[PDB]
From Swiss-Prot:
Entry's Gene Ontology cellular component terms: cytosol
Protein name: Copper transport protein ATOX1
Domain HMA: 1-62
Originating species: Homo sapiens
PROSITE patterns from the UniProt entry: HMA_1 (PS01047), HMA_2 (PS50846)
Pfam families: HMA
Task performed by this protein: Binds and deliver cytosolic copper to the copper ATPase proteins. May be important in cellular antioxidant defense.
Length: 68
């Protein structure tokens, strides 16, 4: 599916950090929108896997829902 999340990305460094955590996890296609502090993910991973993955940044995350 394509899962929309909210992530507290303050700057380009933080957006890049989100890129890398998703990268490590793998099996994801993503579009991080820095000004709107959102990240859209196409994947077969669990919302919960995706959520845990994004929270490893230390930033505030939440699942908004399907985009889709």
């Amino acid at each position: 599916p394509k899962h929309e999340f909210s992530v507290d990305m303050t700057c380009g460094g933080c957006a890049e950090a989100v890129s890398r955590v998703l990268n490590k996890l793998g099996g994801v296609k993503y579009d991080i929108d820095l000004p709107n502090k959102k990240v859209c993910i196409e994947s077969e991973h669990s919302m919960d896997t995706l959520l845990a993955t994004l929270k490893k940044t230390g930033k505030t995350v939440s699942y908004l829902g399907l985009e889709i």
